[PDB]
């Protein structure tokens, strides 16, 4: 049937602008083992340093931007310890850095959007870098000077999959509210996860070689005014799922010493078992038969998952090109990573001169994962260039 | 104009079922000063004990349900200290209690609903009692055995206003997804805020006399099947707002010793200045002229705000009856409090035999507040009985 439009939106939610940002300080992966084991006063565990050398090189990561410098770690030595009371000091750094880093990505995205900031009616903010009261959603509202009546959603500590959660949330906000313009900001950092090495906890050490800082920002709206606004993608469907037989696969305890992770169950085998059934369910209303006829955004939380999925569905090596570029150039930035990849994919399609923002393909899938074991899946539709 | 219904819902979001729950252990307010100053090994600060006696009696609170017993505090003495490392112990108690308490409220609400749990497509979970990874939204999904493909939203540490945020979120989920049934669960406790007294920090002591444990649960859906489903209220509008000149009015730092509050600015004066402009804006599409022609749900975070608002708009003393009942019988349960009040208001209207679930009135306003200074406002429409 047909319903009265009233105050709701007509068409599907669309990505209207994107931008990213990182702290200025970065670390090359080739130099990181020496720096890490030095500032964490840990040069004596030489056998662990060799293990970290091997782990860091299999990450296929080149550089990672980080708020934490040697000087900051020197004035907060408990953060460099493997396990010492440091939460309040980490949260002071989060208050001084997380909303500000999110404003840098938001400013660029609003600049590309072209419309006034007073047209932003909703704000979705994801971060696992610090629990703040009021949250970083409020701090960004003040720094940007957004409307005091903005409808905000603060998402604390959902994990690495929250990039898909933010897209899933913004979709419902924009499609159900006429004229709604949703600012999406994922601002992440290692302020809660960074700690010294332990020969006992190799899970925590492995995460020290991938996690990095960064912030992504989007403008999501339905019914775009095509004379002033330019859509980049369409959010057609977004769903969440808990993988079967995956209890306590990823657990992160927030303690007096910050965020401590635990990864007992095998993650790549869990994704490899379910990846096909999930993505086929997402592509069901599209009629796509070739896995290589769509563009891809996979959360590079574990690079081995990129390789095994590339093999299992027999993808062109160029399909995951934007995914591996962000991983190589920026590392794992929690929820911001998949939005970084969506922007790099957009830029690469425009640069190499292809017909669609989705590298010439019409449909695309976004897939991230985290504690649950939770899987977030989004079906995207590209636009002509 | 008219748009194709497609996969969206036709009518506004409706509250289809409600229920509450509390821990079995409770404390009468008349006995609390002796118990508090005894288990926090603090009987020697006699002048502070007298201050607490006076504060506790002005709360107009009778009893408060609490997970923390004397024995539990005895096996976790750092929780009883004013400021000692205790976060991990608090989060162990949150893992063992918060999802379970939310399941008790959810079971009763699903029982009143009558439909199978496999019809629940969305879950919204609010808590400020513990940051968990995976969250209490996942734990409830497992305990209830809800669909693994449920769309979840975990809201950590938004504060006291999150009861209105959950209603604001569920409204968009139900109205934009056809057939969607949204389970809303606010499960709160003092596991992060409870601590010993300090003659230095009187803000923290005042919160020790109001905050309490409890969980509320709703089923929210649009387009109700009126032969099996019975609506109780309608969510017509829900908005968020930051009050002008209110920076750092309520701040809660999450530290190694748990949640420490700071309340420097005057809260009742902030609400009294803005309460009328906000509620008039919410009632604008209703045509209501008498403030006593609508029913009321005000977050009883500060009882002085109930009295000043009652005076300022000259309300019948019976308007805030359900609000003061929950405050007297249960205290401040963070986001669950206003949903407790909505249920008591529903029960009181049915018991005293009135024409509407809103005590005979047609329209009603829900109003909660917290860190920001943030204000959440919801316009409700009652239903015939």
Numbering used by the authors:
A (entry chain A), B (entry chain A): 7 to 391
The study reports:
In this work, we demonstrated that PECs in agarwood are biosynthesized from a common precursor featuring a C6–C5–C6 skeleton produced by a diarylpentanoid-producing polyketide synthase, hereafter named 2-(2-phenylethyl)chromone precursor synthase (PECPS). The last remaining candidate gene encodes a PKS (PECPS) sharing high amino acid sequence identity with the other four PKSs, as well as the highest 93% similarity with AsCHS1, and this gene maintains the Cys-His-Asn catalytic triad conserved in all known type III PKSs. The crystal structure of PECPS showed typical homodimeric type III PKS folding. Crystal structure analyses suggested that PECPS utilizes unique one-pot catalytic machinery that includes the release of a diketide-CoA intermediate, which has never been reported in other known type III PKSs.
However, a comparison of the structures of PECPS and naringenin chalcone-producing Medicago sativa CHS (MsCHS) suggested that PECPES may differ from MsCHS by the so-called ‘coumaroyl-binding pocket’ (pocket A), which is thought to lock the aromatic moiety of the intermediates. To investigate whether the small pocket A is required for enzyme activity, we mutated Phe340 to the bulkier residue Trp and found that the mutant retained its 1-producing activity and binding ability with 4-hydroxyphenylpropionyl-CoA at levels comparable to those of the wild type in HPLC and isothermal titration calorimetry (ITC) experiments. Furthermore, the crystal structure of the F340W mutant indicated a similar size and shape of the main catalytic cavity to that of the wild type, suggesting that pocket A is not required for substrate and intermediate binding during the enzyme reaction.
